[PDB]
């Protein structure tokens, strides 16, 4: 019973560190939709880790897919349900096909801009 | 060992249903900062569950506290760390003092606009 309590604290730290990386990834993909960012990554002109347009469009569509606008025919609860599953499959490092890539490479690709420098202190 | 796998599926559904309610609450507090909303709840003029200004300012400051703008002196990773903890203390129904209310009443108050009607199909 003593080791049963040590596992509860570890999961709380895991689900919290997840929630931290969540909002980080949300911040990355929201400002990613800006146009001055995608043109900046054309050759990395202001601290952007260079990325070809194939790898850009991979997640530029994911940003549209993961942080979308509400469908008036869809309840805004089940919209978040769909968006929440996308985020969850991303952290799992799964290999389900999505927009032409894999969820494992998605986390790696987004982790590349989670240490780039464009993700903090940007216009 | 068989019952150990049934618990993993239940936690996955719990952490997913959490992630669903998360983004719902984020959507509630983001559009909450709009001015046409707080003036609408002055007497519920377009489907708004009436709320006095004490109970409004409780969460109108929480929205500023929970979905803020980045501090240039703070790394945008630890900013999300702080915001993630606020969301997590909210779902726990805790009783820590915050902006003059309690986290248990916060979830109840926000659950009142999670079934109101102003939270779907709004300008």
Numbering used by the authors:
A (entry chain A), B (entry chain A): 196 to 318
What does the paper say about this structure?
Human Caprin family comprises two members, Caprin-1 and Caprin-2. Previously, we reported Caprin-2 as a new regulator of canonical Wnt signaling through a mechanism of facilitating LRP5/6 phosphorylation. HR1 domain is so far only observed in Caprin-1 and Caprin-2, and this domain shares no sequence similarities with any other known motifs, indicating that HR1 may perform a unique function.
We then tried the corresponding region of hCap2_HR1 (aa S102–K351) based on sequence alignment between hCaprin-2 and zCaprin-2, and this hCap2_HR1 protein was crystallized with significantly improved diffractions. Two molecules of hCap2_HR1 form an asymmetric dimer, with the overall structure roughly resembling the shape of a pair of "scissors" measuring ∼100 Å in height and ∼60 Å in width. The structure of hCap2_HR1 could be divided into two subdomains: a "blade"-like N-lobe (aa A112-L205) and a "bow"-like C-lobe (aa K206-P320). The parts of helices α3-2 and α3′ in the C-lobe of chains A and B, respectively, packed together forming a parallel coiled-coil dimer with the rest helices in the N-lobe forming two antiparallel dimers. The dimeric interface has a total buried area of 2414.4 Å2. Considering the theoretical MW of Cap2_HR1 being 29.2 kDa, we tend to conclude that Cap2_HR exists as a dimer in solution. Close to the junction of the N-lobe and the C-lobe, a cluster of basic residues aligned along the solve-exposed side of the coiled coil of the N-lobe. Surprisingly, we found that Cap2_HR1 binds specifically to phosphatidylinositol 4-phosphate (PI4P), and mutations targeting R200 and R201 in this basic cluster not only disrupt Caprin-2's association with PI4P but also lead to altered cellular localization as well as decreased activities of Caprin-2 in canonical Wnt signaling. WT hCap2_HR1 exhibited a binding affinity with PI4P (KD = 2.0 μm), which is about 70-fold higher than that of the double mutant R200E/R201E (KD = 152 μm).
